[PDB]
Structure formats: structure tokens, C-alpha cells
């Protein structure tokens, strides 16, 4: 548990990765605000189900009470979808790969009121990961940090030790990629500073979804409705 090596920690996290899902995108017709919001939230809803399983496999997560598990997921779920999205869009300059059959450029984001700003931020985060050459091993550490960190200062020492262990795991990966000791702490800082930008995007994405709901643009699943409400 708290006794995994860096190597076993990476192994578990890679093991636990969710699958890439497909969208029900219908290329027979052009997008509308409703149909596009429909595809995206249908996708998010199915992704959330796999996210729940993934979270239960993150070291230390199943040790928490059910209530704290619920709270962490309620705090982190959109951040987690977003970094997932940014990761898979990395080798797709100027495009967001929501699904292998749903690859969107920012001009297509225009058809939903207020989407393109969030598009622009997602695209910038993706470029930033590409320019840092973010590795898969580092990506699954970040995603675990998000899950454990984002709800933690909002209602604990257990979670803090596991977070410290992921930090050690991150440092270990950089060390074995051959970065000098200075580069290790510089790169550790750069990665964690991006998490602040991912929190911001999450906050922006949550308000946008709320507004889509308030305007009756699309029907939201009960899970998604309850996620939104937590906010």
C-alpha cells in the first residue's frame, strides 16, 4: 500500500488505465449546439463509469470511506476527463481527440455557445504537454494526483502520504530518464503548475455545462446531474 516501490507504483497505475471509448458521432449530418453537446455528454457519462473503476484501483483510494471517495470523485471528475482528453490530443496539433471517431478542431467548437474558449484552453494545455514531451508514466501519476489532491483541502493525512509517494515516483521516472537533479525539480514544478491550469479549465467547464443544462440544450444522465449538483 504505502510500501510500493516507485516501479510497482507505475505498474499499478499503467495497469489501471481506462479504455479509450468511441462516440456515437453520426457523420451523415452537420453539428448543432444540441447534437454536439449531446455527443460530448453521452461520452462523458460513459467515461465516468470507467473512471469510477479506475479510481478504485488508485493506491490508497479504496482505503477511504465511501463518503470521501464520493467527494474526491465529485471534485475531480471533470479535471480527470480533461487531462485524459489533452493527453490523447497531444500528437494531434490544433485538434481535440474526444474519441477516435470524434476529432474536433476549434472552428467546430463554435457551434456551441461559449465552448470555443474552453476549446482554446484545452488546445493550449495539449500543446504544452507536447512541448514538454510528457511521458505516459508521468501522465498517469498526474491523473492520480488530481484525484487525490483536488478535493482534499475541501473536507486526510493518509491522502497526503500517498501524494508524497506519487511525488517520489515522479522524481524516480525523471531520474531514470536521465534528467539532472536540478532538471528533476524544475520539471516536477512545471508539471504541477499545469494542474493549476487544469483546475481552472474544470471550473470553466463546469459553469458551461451548468448553463447548457439551465437552457435545456441537452438531457443529462442522472450521474452527470448529481456530479453537477455537487458543485
Amino acid at each position: 500500500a504505502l510500501s510500493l516501490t516507485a516501479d510497482q507504483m507505475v505498474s499499478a497505475l499503467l495497469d489501471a488505465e481506462p479504455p479509450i471509448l468511441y462516440s456515437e458521432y453520426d457523420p451523415t449530418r452537420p453539428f448543432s449546439e444540441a447534437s454536439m453537446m449531446g455527443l460530448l455528454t453521452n461520452l462523458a457519462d460513459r467515461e465516468l463509469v470507467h473512471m469510477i473503476n479506475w479510481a478504485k484501483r488508485v493506491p490508497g483510494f479504496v482505503d477511504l470511506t465511501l463518503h470521501d471517495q464520493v467527494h474526491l470523485l465529485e471534485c475531480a471528475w471533470l479535471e480527470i476527463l480533461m487531462i485524459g482528453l489533452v493527453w490523447r490530443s497531444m500528437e494531434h496539433p490544433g485538434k481535440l481527440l474526444f474519441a477516435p471517431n470524434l476529432l474536433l478542431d476549434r472552428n467546430q467548437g463554435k457551434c456551441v455557445e461559449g465552448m470555443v474558449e474552453i476549446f482554446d484552453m484545452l488546445l493550449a494545455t495539449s500543446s504544452r504537454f507536447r512541448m514538454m514531451n510528457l511521458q505516459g508514466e508521468e501522465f498517469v501519476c498526474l491523473k492520480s494526483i488530481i484525484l487525490l489532491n483536488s478535493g482534499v483541502y475541501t473536507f486526510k493525512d493518509h491522502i497526503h502520504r500517498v501524494l508524497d509517494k506519487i511525488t517520489d515516483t515522479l522524481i524516480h521516472l525523471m531520474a531514470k530518464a536521465g534528467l539532472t537533479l536540478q532538471q528533476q525539480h524544475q520539471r516536477l514544478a512545471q508539471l504541477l503548475l499545469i494542474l493549476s491550469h487544469i483546475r481552472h479549465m474544470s471550473n470553466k467547464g463546469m459553469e458551461h455545462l451548468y448553463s447548457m443544462k439551465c437552457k435545456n440544450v441537452v438531457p443529462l444522465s442522472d450521474l452527470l446531474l448529481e456530479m453537477l449538483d455537487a458543485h
Binding site: 478504485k56 450521474l223 448529481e226
Partner: peptide
């Protein structure tokens, strides 16, 4: 209790 509370319990 919340939908999630329950979902979190299955395997």
C-alpha cells in the same frame, strides 16, 4: 444516498 455512493460499491 447519492447515486455515486451506490455505484462505488459494485464490482
Amino acid at each position: 444516498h447519492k447515486i455515486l455512493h451506490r455505484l462505488l460499491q459494485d464490482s
